[PDB]
From a paper:
Photosystem II (PSII) produces dioxygen by extracting electrons and protons from water, which takes place at the oxygen-evolving complex (OEC), an oxo-bridged Mn4CaO5 cluster with a shape that resembles a distorted chair. In conjunction with the oxidation of the OEC, protons are released in a 1:0:1:2 stoichiometry for the S0–S1, S1–S2, S2–S3 and S3–(S4)–S0 transitions, and two water molecules are split to produce a dioxygen in the S3–(S4)–S0 transition, after which the OEC returns to its most reduced S0 state. Here we use pump-probe serial femtosecond crystallography to reveal the structural dynamics of PSII from nanoseconds to milliseconds after illumination with one flash (1F) or two flashes (2F). We identify structural changes associated with electron transfer, proton release and water delivery at various regions, including QA–QB, YZ, the OEC and the O1, O4 and Cl-1 channels.
YZ reduction is completed by 5 ms, and difference densities disappear at the YZ area and all residues and water molecules are restored. By Δt2 = 5 ms, the translocation is completed, and O6 becomes the eighth ligand to Ca and the sixth ligand to Mn1. The negative difference density near Ca indicates the inward movement of Ca towards the centre of the OEC. The optimal positions of O5 and O6 were determined with the smallest residual densities in the mFo-DFc map, which showed an O5–O6 distance of 1.9 Å at Δt2 = 200 μs, whereas the residual densities at Δt2 = 5 ms were almost comparable for the O5–O6 distances of 1.9–2.4 Å. All of these residues and water molecules become ordered at Δt2 = 5 ms. By Δt2 = 5 ms, the structural changes in the gate area, as well as the high mobilities of water molecules observed at Δt2 = 200 μs, disappear entirely, and Cl-1 becomes ordered and returns to its original position. This indicates that the Cl-1 channel has been restored and reset to the subsequent S-state transition.
Residue numbers in the entry:
A (entry chain A): 11 to 344
B (entry chain V): 1 to 137
C (entry chain C): 23 to 473
D (entry chain E): 4 to 84
E (entry chain D): 11 to 352
F (entry chain F): 12 to 45
Write the structure that this text describes.
C-alpha cells in the first residue's frame, strides 16, 4: 500500500459522495475555473468590442444589464480564431476590452463537459452497469461544441460564437436564420422532431405509468408512498397500460416490452439532437437550408411568391440590420 | 399572362430596327447567361461592381449604346468602360479574351445573340426586379 | 446454418454482423467484399465525373471531388491548372472499376463458399483476438503496406512527373520536387504548432517540399514500426492498460478514424496547397479577402486613396492593422488576415500589405483571380443554389470545399459515437456485465451507503 | 386478437392481389386524368400558369370586401381577356 | 331496460381492431375531414386571391412550401360556412376565399375534443386512471390559443398560422419581429418544459437500458422481459447510486419520477399558451423601459437587447409589404432601415 | 372463417382509396410545363 496506490484507490473509490475518477481529475479544475470566471464576468466585466470595430457591447449586471439582457460577450473579431490567454495581453484591461473572458470560459467548459461524459462512462464501469448513458449525453455535448467551437471555426472567428447570455442566445439564433435559413434545413427539422417528440413521449410515458399505478394507498395520502425505494416488484401494471393505449390507437401501435419501450424513449430525442447538432456543424461550413426563392414562375415569367419567398423577406430584414456598422463591402461572406 | 412575340421583340440596332426572338432563343439565352454570366450578373446587377447594372435604361446611356442586340453582341466581343474610353477585355469575359476566360471558348455568334436577347427581354417581364437587387427579391 | 440465427449466436438480426466475430473466414470475406465496394465507388464515380465534365468550366463549377484529387497529383493538367488531357482520369476510373470485380470475387467466395474459420485451415492466416503476438504481427504487415503507400506519393513527386504546385512562379504548374524537406525540426515542428489562428498545426503546410519530405519520414516510420511489431510482443505496461478483444480493437480504430475525419474537415476548409483553389474553389477566408481586394481595386481606379480612407467605425475602410501591427484588409474580413495565397502574396511586404505595391503593382491577372474567388465563395443551399441564404435562384453552385467538409464532419462525428459505443461495450463484456446486472451479485448492494 | 382476418394473411392471398391489381391502378389513373384533363383547375378555382395575371398588369387580384368577395373574384376572372 | 340505447352502447364498445365508442361519433368524422381538407388544399388549392401566393402541388409547390392559407384579411373573423353569405354555396369560390382554413381549424378543434373524450372513454372501460387525458389538455390549450384566440384578438383570421411547413416558419419569424416573443417569460417557461421534457425522456430511457438486470443469456437484452413478470426489469438501487454520485441528486421514488415526466412538458405547454393569449391583444414583453431610457440618452450604451430590436425593425420593414398585401404598404428604398453596405 | 367487410375494412379504405387517387394526380403534375 504505497502512496500512489492509495491515491489511485481514493480517486476511483465508489464510496465518495461524489465520484471523482480520472476524468474527474480534469473535470473538477476546468469546471471550477470556467464557473468562477463566468460568475465574476457576468456581474462585473466591462463592455467588450465583440465585432472588432471599437464598438463595445455591455454584458454585465453592473454596467446596465438585467438577468435577461446580460451576457459574457464573445471575444473580438480582430482576434478571429487566435488563442488569447491572459498572458498574451499587455494588461488585464486589454484582455477584458477584447473579450478574453469568453475564450477562457468556453475552452475550460468544453474540456470539463467532455470529461463529464467520460466520467459517466467511468462510474458505470465501477458499479457493474451497462455503459451507454454517456452516449445519450453526447447529444447535448455535441450541440455545445457546435455553437461554441465548430461554428467559430467554419466562420473564422469566436466573435460569431454563441454569447453566454439569454438575449445573446436570441441574437445568435436570428443572425443564424438570416445567413443559413436554418428553419428550411432538414437537420434542424429533425431536431425539432427530436425535442417535440421527446416532450410528447415524456408526457406519454409519464401519464401511462401514472394511470396504471397499483392501488397501495388511501385517498388522504400521496400515491407516491405506495412505492418503496428498492422494492423487488413493479409499482404499476404494464398490461393495463398496454390495454389502454393499444385501444386508444390500435393494439400493434403500443408497446408491451418495457425494455424496447425504454430504448425508444432513449433513442428518439438523442438521435434527433444529434441531427440538430450536425445541422449547426454543417451550416458552419455554409451548406445551408433549402432555397426556393423565386422557384415558382408563371407562363410569362412573372415570379409567383410562395411562403418561402415571405421567409426570404424576413431573412433580408435580419441580414441588412445585423452588425449595422461592421460591413464595408456588399457581400457578407462570413 | 404569356410569353408573346410582342414580349420577344427587341431593338436590333440603334436605328430602330427590331428583331423578334423565338421562345427557344429566349430560353437558350437564359441558360447561356446562367452558364457564362450569372455568377456576377444574377438578377441583372453586377456583384463585383454594383454601380453598373443591366437595366435597359442603364444600357441606353452607355457609350456606345448597349440597349440593343448589336451593341450587346459587340460588348461580348470587345467590352469597354461605360464611357467607351477603355477596353476591358483583360478583366471582363469576352471573345477577345476567351484564352483567359475559357468559358467563352465555346460560344458562337448565335449564342451571343441569344444571351443579348435574354438581357433585353427579362426587364420587360420582371420590371424593377431586373437590376434592382435585394430590395425587390 | 452456423451461427446464423439469434438462438445459436445470441445476436439478433439487427446486430447480425456481430455473429462474425469468431468466424475469421467469413469475417475475411466481409472485409474483402467491402473493400471491393470502396474501390467500386472510386472507379464508377470517376467515370461519372468524366462523362459529365466540360473542360472549359472550372472543376469547382461542376460538382467534382475525385478528378480534383487526380489533377492535384499532376495528371491531366498544365499551367494554371488547365486540363490538357482527360485520358489519365479515364485510366484511374477504369482500373479501380476493374479491380473491384477481383475484390468482390474474393469477398463473395470467402463469405459464402470458403472455410468459415481459418484456424483449422492455416495457422498463418488464422488468428485469435487474444493472441497479442499474432495481432501485432498482422498490424505490422499493414503498417509496412501503408508505408509503401506513402512512398508511392514521393515517387510520383520526384520521379514520375511531379505534383501540381499552386505556388509555382507563373501561375501554378506541375513541378517535379527535387529537394524534399528532410530536416526533422521542420517536419516534426509542424506537429508542435498550436492549432489556433495564425498557426494552424499541420493544416498550415504550404509548400510541396514539406509535403513530400513529410511523406518520406512517414514512410520510413511506418515500415520501421511494422518490422518492430512483427518481431515484438506487447510489453507488460501495455498489456495492463488495454482491453484485448475484437470489439476493443474495432473501438480503437473507430476513435482513430473519427480524429482523422475531423482533421480532414479542417484540411479541406483551410488549406489551399494540397487542395488547390484552381480545382476545389477558394477557401472561405480566401473569398472574403478577395472581396476586400476587389473593391480596393475598383475604388482606387476611381481615384480613392485607399491607404488613408477612414471607414464609418474609425478603422480604415480598406486597410487597417492586425493586433500585432501587420497591414491587412479591413471590414469584417479582418478576421481572415492569416490567409496566404499566390494571387495575394506579391502585394505583401515585411509589414504586411504594402501600400506602394497596392498603388503601382496590381496586375490584371490578380483582379481576375479576386473577382472569380469572390463570386465563388463556399456558400450555398442544400439544393445547390449558390450564394447567401437570401439570394435568388439562378446559379447552380455549392463549393466542393463545403461538400467535403460537411460530409466528413458528419462521418467523423458518428465515428466518435461508434468509438464510445464499442469501447464502452468492450470494457463491459471483458469484465462480464454487458448483458445486465446479476441479481444475486448486484455490486451496489455490497457497498456502504452514501449517507 | 379482435377477430378480423390478419393483414399478413390477406395481403399474401392470391385473391387480394387479383382484386387490387385492378383497383389500385384504376384509382391512380383516375387521379392522373383529374389533372391531365384540367378538371382539377376548374373544380378548385386554381390558376393555370397563364392565368395569374393579365398580360401587362402586375397587381395581385386580392379580395378586399367581405360580402362582395364572390363578385370581386368573378370580376378579376373576366379581366383575363 | 335493454332498449335501443343500450344495444347501440353494446355495438359501439365492441372489442375490435379500431375501438369506436360514443366518442368516435365526434372523433372520426372531424379528424378525417380535417386531415382530408389539409391534403385536398395542399394538393389543389391556391392562395392567390387571399395572400398573393401559390400554395399547392398543382401550382408547383413542394412539401415544404404547400399550405392551406388563412382567409383574406377582409373576411374578418367570419365562420366562412360553405352556405354563408360570402361563398353562398359555391364550392369553388369558397376554396378561393379561404373556406378550407376555417373548415380545417373548426373540424380539427372538435376532433381534438373527440380524441380527449376517447381517452376518457377507453380509460373508464379498462379501469385505469385518466392521466393520459389530463396530459392531452396541454396540446389542446396550445391549439386553441394559437389557432383560435390569437387571431380572434387580432384583426382577422388572416393573422392566424397557415397550415403548412414554410407557412409556420413565417409565423415564427413574424412573432420575433412584431412581438419580440423570445423575450416573453411565458415562452421561456414553455421552452424549459419542452427541452426539459426531451431531457427527461432521453435520460430515463438511457438509465433503464443501462441498469437492466441480466434476466437472459442473449446479447440482445430485449428478449429477457415478460409483460406479466412481477419484478422490476432494471435496478432502481443502482440507478439511484449512479446519479447521486454523478449529479449530486437522484430519483428514489419511481412513482414521483413518472409523475414528474408528465408534469414538466404539460406545464410548459400550458405556460406558452398563456403568453400567446397575451399576444392576441398585442400585450407583449417587447421592451425593457429602463434600457430604452438609458439608450435614448447615451449613444454609447449597447446591449444584446438593443441589438435584437434593430433586427426586429428590419424584419418588420422588409417583410410587411409582401406579408400584409391588403395594407398596400409602399416603402420607398430610401426609408428602408439598413446597416452599412448591406 | 373470417368476415370480409368489417369496421376495420371501412377505416382502411377511407384512407387508402383517396391516397392512391391523390398520388396519381400528383404524379401527373410532374409533367406540367409553364
Ligand atoms: C485524443 C484526444 C486528445 C485531445 C487533445 C486536446 C488538445 C487540444 C485539442 C484541439 C483543440 C482545437 C481548437 C482549435 C481548433 C481549430 O481552430 O481548428 C483550425 C485548425 C486549422 O487552423 C487554421 O489553419 C490555417 C492554416 O492555413 C494557412 O496555410 C494554408 C496553406 O495552404 C493557406 O495558405 C491559408 O490561407 C493559411 O491561412 C490558418 O493558420 C488559420 O488561422 C487556422 O485557424 O485545424 C487544425 O489544426 C486541425 C483540426 C483540429 C481538430 C478540430 C477540432 C474538432 C473537434 C470536434 C469535436 C466534436 C466533439 C463531439 C462531442 C460529442
Ligand atoms: C376550451 C376548450 C374549447 C374547445 C374548442 C371549442 C371550439 C368551439 C368553436 C367556437 C368558435 C367561436 C367563433 C368566434 C367567432 C368570433 O368571435 O367572431 C368575432 C365576432 C365579432 O366580429 C368582429 O367585430 C369587430 C368589431 O366590429 C364592431 O366595431 C366595428 C368597428 O368599429 C364596427 O362598428 C362593426 O359594425 C362592429 O360590429 C370587427 O368588425 C371584426 O372584423 C369582426 O370579425 O364576435 C362574435 O362572432 C361573437 C363574439 C361574442 C362571443 C365571444 C366568445 C367566444 C370567443 C372568446 C375569445 C376571446 C377573444 C378576445 C381575445 C382574447
Ligand atoms: C458491406 C456490407 C455487408 C457485408 C460484406 C456483410 C457480410 C456478411 N454478413 Mg452481414 N449484414 C449487413 C451488411 C453486410 N454483411 C447489413 C446491412 C445487415 C442488416 C440487414 C446485416 C445482417 C446480417 C445477419 C443477420 C447475418 C449477416 C451475416 C453475414 C455473413 C454471411 C452472409 C450469408 O451467409 O448470406 C448468404 C446469402 C446469400 C447466399 C444470398 C446472396 C449473397 C451474395 C453474397 C450476394 C452477392 C451479389 C453480388 C453482386 C455477386 C458478385 C459476384 C461477382 C463479383 C463475381 C457475411 C460475411 C450472417 C452471419 O454472420 O453468419 C455467420 C448473418 O447471420 N449479416
Ligand atoms: C468500421 C465501422 C464499424 C464496424 C465494422 C462495426 C461493427 C459492428 N457494430 Mg458498430 N457502429 C459504428 C461503426 C462500426 N460498427 C458507428 C460509426 C456507429 C455509430 C452510429 C456504430 C453504432 C453501433 C450500435 C448502436 C451497435 C453497433 C453494433 C455493431 C455490431 C453489429 C453490427 C450490425 O450487424 O449492423 C447491421 C446493420 C444495420 C442494421 C443497418 C443500419 C442501417 C443504417 C442506420 C443506415 C444508415 C443510412 C445510410 C448511411 C444512408 C441512407 C440509406 C437509404 C437512403 C437507403 C458489429 C460488430 C451492434 C453491437 O453492439 O454488437 C456488438 C450495436 O448494437 N454499432
Ligand atoms: C464523401 C462523400 C461524398 C461527397 C462529399 C459527395 C459530393 C457530391 N456528390 Mg457524390 N456520391 C457519394 C459520396 C459523396 N458525394 C456516394 C456514396 C454516391 C453513391 C450514392 C455518390 C454519387 C453521386 C451522384 C450520382 C452525384 C453525386 C454528386 C455530388 C455533388 C452534389 C451533391 C448533392 O447535391 O447532394 C444532395 C444531398 C443529399 C442527397 C443529402 C443526403 C443526406 C443523407 C441521406 C443523410 C445521411 C446522414 C448519415 C450518413 C446517416 C446517419 C443515420 C444515423 C441513424 C446514424 C457533390 C460534389 C452529383 C454531381 O454533381 O456529380 C458531378 C451527382 O449527380 N454523387
Ligand atoms: C487481404 C485479403 C485476403 C487474405 C488475407 C486472403 C487469404 C486467403 N485466401 Mg483469399 N482471396 C482474396 C483476398 C484475400 N485472401 C482475393 C482478392 C481473391 C480473389 C482473387 C481471393 C480468392 C481466393 C480463392 C479462390 C482462395 C483463397 C484462399 C485464401 C487462403 C489461402 C491463400 C494462400 O495461401 O495464398 C498464398 C499466397 C499467394 C498465392 C500470393 C498471392 C499474391 C497476389 C496474388 C499478388 C498481389 C500481391 C499484392 C500484395 C496485392 C496488392 C493488392 C492491393 C493493391 C489491394 C487464405 C486464408 C484459398 C482458400 O480459401 O482455401 C480453402 C482459396 O482457395 N482466396
Ligand atoms: C496503427 C499504428 C500503430 C498501432 C495501433 C500501434 C500500437 C501499439 N504500439 Mg506501436 N508503433 C507504430 C505504430 C502503431 N503502434 C509505429 C509507426 C512505430 C515506430 C515509431 C511504433 C513503435 C512502437 C514502440 C517503441 C512501442 C510501440 C508499442 C505499441 C503498443 C502500445 C501502444 C500505446 O500504449 O500507445 C499509447 C500512446 C502513448 C502512451 C503516447 C504517450 C501519451 C501521449 C501524451 C498522448 C498524446 C495524445 C495527443 C492527442 C497527440 C495528438 C497529436 C500529437 C502528435 C501532437 C500498441 C500495441 C509499445 C509496445 O508495447 O511495443 C511492443 C512500445 O513500446 N509501438
Ligand atoms: C465577373 C467576373 C463578371 C462576369 C462573369 C460577367 N460580368 Fe459583365 N460586368 C462585370 C463588371 C465588373 C462590369 C462593369 C465593367 C466596367 O468597369 O464598366 C460589367 C459590365 C457589363 C456590362 C455593361 C453594363 C452597363 O450597364 O453598361 C454588360 C452588358 C455585361 N457586363 C455583360 C456581361 C455578359 C453578357 C456576361 C456573360 C458573357 C458577363 N457580363 C459576365 C462583371 C462580370
Ligand atoms: C457478402 C454479403 C453481402 C455483400 C456483398 C458484397 C459487398 C459484394 C460486393 C461485390 C462487388 C464489389 C462486385 C463488383 C463487381 C464489378 C464488376 C462486375 C465490374 C465490371 C466492369 C465492367 C464490365 C467495365 C466496363 C466498362 C469499361 C471496361 C470501359 C468503360 C465503360 C464500361 C463501364 C462499360 C451482402 C451485404 C449482400 C449480404 C450477404 C453477404
Ligand atoms: C505526412 C506529412 C507531414 C508529417 C506528418 C507527421 C510526421 C505526422 C506524425 C504523426 C504522429 C507521430 C502522430 C502521433 C499520434 C499519437 C496519438 C494519437 C496518441 C494517442 C494516445 C492514446 C489514445 C493513449 C490513450 C491512453 C491513455 C492516455 C492512458 C492510458 C490508456 C490509454 C492507452 C487508452 C507534414 C505535416 C510535415 C507535412 C504534410 C505531410
Ligand atoms: C376537404 C373537403 C371534403 C373532404 C375531402 C376528403 C375527405 C379528402 C381526403 C383526401 C385524402 C385522404 C388524401 C390523401 C392523400 C395522401 C397522400 C398525398 C400521401 C402521400 C404519401 C407520400 C408521398 C409518402 C411519402 C413517404 C413518407 C411520408 C415517409 C415514408 C416514406 C415515403 C417516402 C413513402 C368534403 C368532400 C367532405 C367536403 C368539401 C371539403
Ligand atoms: C338521447 C338519448 C336518451 C335516451 S332516451 C330512451 O331510450 C330508451 C332506449 O334504451 C327507450 O326505451 C326510452 O323509451 C327512451 O326514452
Ligand atoms: Cl466587410
Amino acid at each position: 500500500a504505497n502512496l500512489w496506490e492509495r491515491f489511485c484507490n481514493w480517486v476511483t473509490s465508489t464510496d465518495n459522495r461524489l465520484y471523482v475518477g480520472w476524468f474527474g481529475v480534469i473535470m473538477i479544475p476546468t469546471l471550477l475555473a470556467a464557473t468562477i470566471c463566468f460568475v465574476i464576468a457576468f456581474i462585473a466585466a466591462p463592455p467588450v468590442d465583440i465585432d472588432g470595430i471599437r464598438e463595445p457591447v455591455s454584458g454585465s449586471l453592473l454596467y446596465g444589464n438585467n438577468i435577461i439582457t446580460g451576457a459574457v460577450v464573445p471575444s473580438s473579431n480582430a482576434i478571429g480564431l487566435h488563442f488569447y490567454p491572459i498572458w498574451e495581453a499587455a494588461s488585464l484591461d486589454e484582455w477584458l476590452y477584447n473579450g478574453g473572458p469568453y475564450q477562457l470560459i468556453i475552452f475550460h467548459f468544453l474540456l470539463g463537459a467532455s470529461c463529464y461524459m467520460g466520467r459517466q462512462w467511468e462510474l458505470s464501469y465501477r458499479l457493474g452497469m451497462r455503459p451507454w448513458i454517456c452516449v445519450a449525453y453526447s447529444a447535448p455535448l455535441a450541440s455545445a461544441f457546435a455553437v461554441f467551437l465548430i461554428y467559430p471555426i467554419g466562420q473564422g472567428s469566436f466573435s460569431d460564437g454563441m454569447p453566454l447570455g439569454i438575449s445573446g442566445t436570441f441574437n445568435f439564433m436570428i443572425v443564424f436564420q438570416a445567413e443559413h435559413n436554418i428553419l428550411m434545413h432538414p437537420f434542424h427539422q429533425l431536431g425539432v422532431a427530436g425535442v417535440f417528440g421527446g416532450a410528447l413521449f415524456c408526457a406519454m410515458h409519464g401519464s401511462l405509468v401514472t394511470s396504471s399505478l397499483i392501488r397501495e394507498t388511501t385517498e388522504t395520502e400521496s400515491a407516491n408512498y405506495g412505492y418503496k425505494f428498492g422494492q423487488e416488484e413493479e409499482t404499476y401494471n404494464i398490461v393495463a397500460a398496454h390495454g389502454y393505449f393499444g385501444r386508444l390507437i390500435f393494439q400493434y401501435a403500443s408497446f408491451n416490452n418495457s425494455r424496447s419501450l425504454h430504448f425508444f424513449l432513449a433513442a428518439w430525442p438523442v438521435v434527433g439532437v444529434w441531427f440538430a447538432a450536425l445541422g449547426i456543424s454543417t451550416m458552419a461550413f455554409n451548406l445551408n437550408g433549402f432555397n426556393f426563392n423565386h422557384s415558382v414562375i408563371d407562363a410569362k415569367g412573372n415570379v409567383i411568391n410562395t411562403w418561402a419567398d415571405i421567409i426570404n423577406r424576413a431573412n433580408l430584414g435580419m441580414e441588412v440590420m445585423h452588425e449595422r456598422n461592421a460591413h464595408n463591402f456588399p457581400l457578407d461572406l462570413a | 399572362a404569356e410569353l408573346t412575340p410582342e414580349v420577344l421583340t427587341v431593338p436590333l440596332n440603334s436605328e430602330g430596327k427590331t428583331i423578334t426572338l423565338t421562345e427557344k432563343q429566349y430560353l437558350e439565352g437564359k441558360r447561356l447567361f446562367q452558364y457564362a454570366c450569372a455568377s456576377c450578373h444574377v438578377g441583372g446587377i453586377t456583384k463585383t461592381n454594383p454601380s453598373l447594372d443591366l437595366r435597359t435604361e442603364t444600357l441606353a446611356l452607355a457609350t456606345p449604346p448597349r440597349d440593343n442586340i448589336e451593341g450587346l453582341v459587340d460588348y461580348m466581343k470587345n467590352p469597354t468602360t461605360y464611357d467607351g474610353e477603355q477596353e476591358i477585355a483583360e478583366v471582363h469575359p469576352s471573345l477577345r479574351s476567351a484564352d483567359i476566360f475559357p468559358k467563352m471558348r465555346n460560344l458562337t455568334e448565335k449564342d451571343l445573340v441569344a444571351i443579348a436577347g435574354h438581357i433585353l427581354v427579362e426587364p420587360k417581364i420582371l420590371g424593377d426586379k431586373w437590376g434592382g437587387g435585394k430590395v425587390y427579391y | 446454418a452456423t451461427n446464423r440465427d439469434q438462438e445459436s449466436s445470441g445476436f439478433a438480426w439487427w446486430a447480425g454482423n456481430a455473429r462474425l466475430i469468431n468466424l475469421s473466414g467469413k469475417l475475411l470475406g466481409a472485409h474483402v467484399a467491402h473493400a471491393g465496394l470502396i474501390v467500386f465507388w472510386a472507379g464508377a464515380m470517376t467515370l461519372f465525373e468524366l462523362a459529365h465534365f466540360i473542360p472549359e468550366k472550372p472543376m469547382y463549377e461542376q460538382g467534382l471531388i475525385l478528378i480534383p484529387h487526380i489533377a492535384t497529383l499532376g495528371w491531366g493538367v498544365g499551367p494554371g491548372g488547365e486540363v490538357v488531357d482527360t485520358f489519365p482520369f479515364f485510366v484511374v476510373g477504369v482500373v479501380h472499376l476493374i479491380s473491384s470485380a477481383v475484390l468482390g470475387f474474393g469477398g463473395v467466395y470467402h463469405a459464402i463458399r470458403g472455410p468459415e474459420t481459418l484456424e483449422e485451415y492455416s495457422s498463418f492466416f488464422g488468428y485469435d483476438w487474444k493472441d497479442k503476438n499474432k495481432m501485432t504481427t498482422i498490424l505490422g504487415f499493414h503498417l509496412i503496406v501503408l508505408g509503401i503507400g506513402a512512398l508511392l506519393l514521393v515517387a510520383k513527386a520526384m520521379f514520375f512527373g511531379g505534383l501540381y504546385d499552386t505556388w509555382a512562379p507563373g501561375g501554378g504548374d506541375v513541378r517535379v520536387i527535387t529537394n524534399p524537406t528532410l530536416d526533422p525540426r521542420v517536419i516534426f515542428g509542424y506537429l508542435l504548432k498550436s492549432p489556433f489562428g495564425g498557426e494552424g498545426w499541420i493544416v498550415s503546410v504550404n509548400n510541396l517540399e514539406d509535403v513530400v519530405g513529410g511523406h518520406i519520414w512517414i514512410g520510413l516510420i511506418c515500415i520501421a514500426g511494422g518490422i518492430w511489431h512483427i518481431l515484438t510482443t506487447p510489453f507488460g505496461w501495455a498489456r495492463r492498460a488495454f482491453i484485448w478483444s475484437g470489439e476493443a480493437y474495432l473501438s480503437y480504430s473507430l476513435g482513430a478514424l473519427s480524429m482523422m475525419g475531423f482533421i480532414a474537415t479542417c484540411f479541406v476548409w483551410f488549406n489551399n496547397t494540397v487542395y488547390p483553389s484552381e480545382f476545389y474553389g477558394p477557401t472561405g477566408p480566401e473569398a472574403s479577402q478577395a472581396q476586400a481586394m476587389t473593391f480596393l481595386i475598383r475604388d482606387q481606379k476611381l481615384g480613392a486613396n485607399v491607404g488613408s480612407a477612414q471607414g464609418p467605425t474609425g478603422l480604415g475602410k480598406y486597410l487597417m492593422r492586425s493586433p500585432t501591427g501587420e497591414i491587412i484588409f479591413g471590414g469584417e474580413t479582418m478576421r481572415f488576415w492569416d490567409f496566404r495565397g499566390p494571387w495575394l502574396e506579391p502585394l505583401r511586404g515585411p509589414n504586411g500589405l504594402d501600400l506602394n505595391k497596392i498603388k503601382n503593382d496590381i496586375q490584371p491577372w490578380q483582379e481576375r483571380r479576386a473577382a472569380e474567388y469572390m463570386t465563388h465563395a463556399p456558400l450555398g443551399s442544400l439544393n445547390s443554389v449558390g450564394g447567401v441564404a437570401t439570394e435568388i435562384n439562378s446559379v447552380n453552385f455549392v463549393s466542393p470545399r463545403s461538400w467535403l467538409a460537411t460530409s466528413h464532419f458528419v462521418l467523423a462525428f458518428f465515428f466518435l459515437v461508434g468509438h464510445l459505443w464499442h469501447a464502452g461495450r468492450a470494457r463491459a463484456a471483458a469484465a462480464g456485465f454487458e448483458k445486465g446486472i446479476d441479481r444475486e451479485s448486484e455490486p451496489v448492494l455490497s457497498m456502504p451507503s452514501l449517507d | 386478437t379482435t377477430g378480423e382476418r390478419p393483414f399478413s394473411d390477406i395481403i399474401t392471398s392470391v385473391r387480394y392481389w387479383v382484386i387490387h391489381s385492378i383497383t389500385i391502378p384504376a384509382l391512380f389513373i383516375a387521379g392522373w386524368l383529374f389533372v391531365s384533363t384540367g378538371l382539377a383547375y376548374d373544380v378548385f378555382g386554381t390558376p393555370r400558369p397563364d392565368s395569374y395575371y393579365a398580360q401587362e398588369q402586375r397587381s395581385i387580384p386580392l379580395v378586399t370586401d367581405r360580402f362582395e368577395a364572390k363578385q370581386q373574384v368573378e370580376t378579376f376572372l373576366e379581366q383575363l381577356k | 331496460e335493454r332498449g335501443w340505447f343500450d344495444i347501440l352502447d353494446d355495438w359501439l364498445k365492441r372489442d375490435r381492431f379500431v375501438f369506436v365508442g360514443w366518442s368516435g361519433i365526434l372523433l372520426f368524422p372531424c379528424a378525417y375531414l380535417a386531415l382530408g381538407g389539409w391534403l385536398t388544399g395542399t394538393t389543389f388549392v391556391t392562395s392567390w386571391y387571399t395572400h398573393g401566393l401559390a400554395s399547392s402541388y398543382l401550382e408547383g409547390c413542394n412539401f415544404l412550401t404547400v399550405a392551406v392559407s388563412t382567409p383574406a384579411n377582409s373576411m374578418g373573423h367570419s365562420l366562412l360556412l360553405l352556405w354563408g353569405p360570402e361563398a353562398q354555396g359555391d364550392f369553388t369560390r369558397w376554396c378561393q376565399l379561404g373556406g378550407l382554413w376555417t373548415f380545417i381549424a373548426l373540424h380539427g378543434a372538435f376532433g381534438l375534443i373527440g380524441f380527449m373524450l376517447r381517452q376518457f372513454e377507453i380509460a373508464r372501460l379498462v379501469g385505469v386512471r385518466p392521466y393520459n387525458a389530463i396530459a392531452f389538455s396541454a396540446p389542446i390549450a396550445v391549439f386553441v390559443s394559437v389557432f383560435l384566440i390569437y387571431p380572434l384578438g387580432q384583426s382577422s383570421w388572416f393573422f392566424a398560422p397557415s397550415f403548412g411547413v414554410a407557412a409556420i416558419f413565417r409565423f415564427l419569424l413574424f412573432f420575433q419581429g412584431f412581438h419580440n416573443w423570445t423575450l416573453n417569460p411565458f415562452h421561456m417557461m414553455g421552452v424549459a418544459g419542452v427541452l426539459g421534457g426531451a431531457l427527461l425522456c432521453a435520460i430515463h430511457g438511457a438509465t433503464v437500458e443501462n441498469t437492466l438486470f441480466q434476466d437472459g443469456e442473449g446479447a440482445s437484452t430485449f428478449r429477457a422481459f415478460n409483460p406479466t413478470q412481477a419484478e422490476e426489469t432494471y435496478s432502481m438501487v443502482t440507478a439511484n447510486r449512479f446519479w447521486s454520485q454523478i449529479f449530486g441528486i437522484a430519483f428514489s421514488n419511481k412513482r414521483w419520477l413518472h409523475f414528474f415526466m408528465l408534469f414538466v412538458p404539460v406545464t410548459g405547454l400550458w405556460m406558452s399558451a398563456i403568453g400567446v393569449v397575451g399576444l392576441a391583444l398585442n400585450l407583449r414583453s417587447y421592451d425593457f423601459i429602463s434600457q430604452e431610457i438609458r439608450a435614448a440618452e447615451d449613444p454609447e450604451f449597447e446591449t444584446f437587447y438593443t441589438k435584437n430590436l434593430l433586427l426586429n425593425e428590419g424584419i418588420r420593414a422588409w417583410m410587411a409589404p409582401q406579408d400584409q398585401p391588403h395594407e398596400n404598404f409602399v416603402f420607398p428604398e430610401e426609408v428602408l432601415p439598413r446597416g452599412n453596405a448591406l | 372463417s373470417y368476415p370480409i367487410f368489417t369496421v376495420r375494412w371501412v377505416a382502411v379504405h377511407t384512407l387508402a382509396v383517396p391516397t392512391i387517387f391523390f398520388l396519381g394526380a400528383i404524379a401527373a403534375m410532374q409533367f406540367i410545363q409553364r
